Amino acid sequence: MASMSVSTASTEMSVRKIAAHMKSNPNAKVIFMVGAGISTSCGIPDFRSPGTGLYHNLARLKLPYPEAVFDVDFFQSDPLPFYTLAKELYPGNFRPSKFHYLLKLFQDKDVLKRVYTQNIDTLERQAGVKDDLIIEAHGSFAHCHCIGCGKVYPPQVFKSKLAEHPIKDFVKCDVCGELVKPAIVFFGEDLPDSFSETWLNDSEWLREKITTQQPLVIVVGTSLAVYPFASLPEEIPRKVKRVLCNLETVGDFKANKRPTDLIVHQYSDEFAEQLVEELGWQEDFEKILTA
Amino acid sequence: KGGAKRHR
Numbered sequence A: 001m002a003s004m005s006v007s008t009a010s011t012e013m014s015v016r017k018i019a020a021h022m023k024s025n026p027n028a029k030v031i032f033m034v035g036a037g038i039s040t041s042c043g044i045p046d047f048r049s050p051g052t053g054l055y056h057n058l059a060r061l062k063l064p065y066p067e068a069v070f071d072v073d074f075f076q077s078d079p080l081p082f083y084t085l086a087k088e089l090y091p092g093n094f095r096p097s098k099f100h101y102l103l104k105l106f107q108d109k110d111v112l113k114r115v116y117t118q119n120i121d122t123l124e125r126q127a128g129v130k131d132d133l134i135i136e137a138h139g140s141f142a143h144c145h146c147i148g149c150g151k152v153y154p155p156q157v158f159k160s161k162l163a164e165h166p167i168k169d170f171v172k173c174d175v176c177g178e179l180v181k182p183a184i185v186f187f188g189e190d191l192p193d194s195f196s197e198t199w200l201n202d203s204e205w206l207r208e209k210i211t212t213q214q215p216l217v218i219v220v221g222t223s224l225a226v227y228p229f230a231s232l233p234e235e236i237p238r239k240v241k242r243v244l245c246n247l248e249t250v251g252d253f254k255a256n257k258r259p260t261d262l263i264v265h266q267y268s269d270e271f272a273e274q275l276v277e278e279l280g281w282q283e284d285f286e287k288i289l290t291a
Numbered sequence B: 001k002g003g004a005k006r007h008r
């Protein structure tokens, strides 16, 4: 988990402000919005990166372009690339990062309102974050469903096929015969109802806090290039302080910056280390990491 | 509700 700063520039002062805000608003909570950047330190291979075995396996299987692996039409025409990706990225193959544990720490301190994640690694949940506080915007491998009729299936049959050599005779629905796949949201598919429903509730929650425990929304490791998830930042109340911890300034933080926006160019794990330091929760955090 | 998963 060892981390280092992205550059010679120190982000400790910027992180100090966050800790200061939380110290001034002790009964406040934080909403996190996270992306693939928070799992990079976990060693998860990026399917879009030529340096990975996953990318080359997909290329050899004749996948047209990386994101076609998450395309419904392509999947129906050829499920092998996706099965191949699922074998390598199946939840449980990796371990949570220091940042994932930070979410658990905030939960323990009761300062976590919600974590909206567009990742499908389920690492927030694996790290101990409670189901009620997690919004897996793009689904997960916890359930499987028929892409045709929607019949639900336990995730085990699909997972069992990933261990066969070679992978063939893909899982089909016992009702309509169409392909069954993990409950992951593919491009072109709608997100689970809980996404919009919970954001509707947390949006009112945010606004009501403004008029008095001022909240904080921290966006971490996401390029904000996938909608509707990417619409969340701009929908945050102007009177609610936004924080962006990302190697680059992206999305609404770039297009329409706000006076109170706090941008922190830092690795998520280093950010976690620094924030825990400024909050003085090193002891409790150390316990979690060693647990 | 936002629509289907997509870019842009």
Ligand SMILES: Nc1ncnc2c1ncn2[C@@H]1O[C@H](COP(=O)(O)OP(=O)(O)OC[C@H]2O[C@@H](O)[C@H](O)[C@@H]2O)[C@@H](O)[C@H]1O
Pocket (backbone or CB within 6 Å): A034, A035, A036, A037, A038, A040, A041, A067, A118, A119, A220, A221, A222, A223, A224, A225, A226, A245, A246, A247, A248, A250, A266, A267, A268, A269
């Ligand atoms: N250790 C890190 N700490 C902070 N930010 C990081 C880190 N590593 C990467 N980042 C930043 O996190 C962002 C990650 O962007 P993406 O890789 O595009 O991922 P994400 O936005 O979450 O998108 C997922 C994408 O993966 C596919 O599921 C789907 O194709 C989709 O386009 C980038 O803006 C990058 O600068």
Ligand SMILES: [Cl-]
Pocket (backbone or CB within 6 Å): A029
């Ligand atoms: Cl509350």
Ligand SMILES: [Zn+2]
Pocket (backbone or CB within 6 Å): A146, A147, A148, A149, A150, A151, A173, A174, A175, A176, A177, A178
């Ligand atoms: Zn079916």
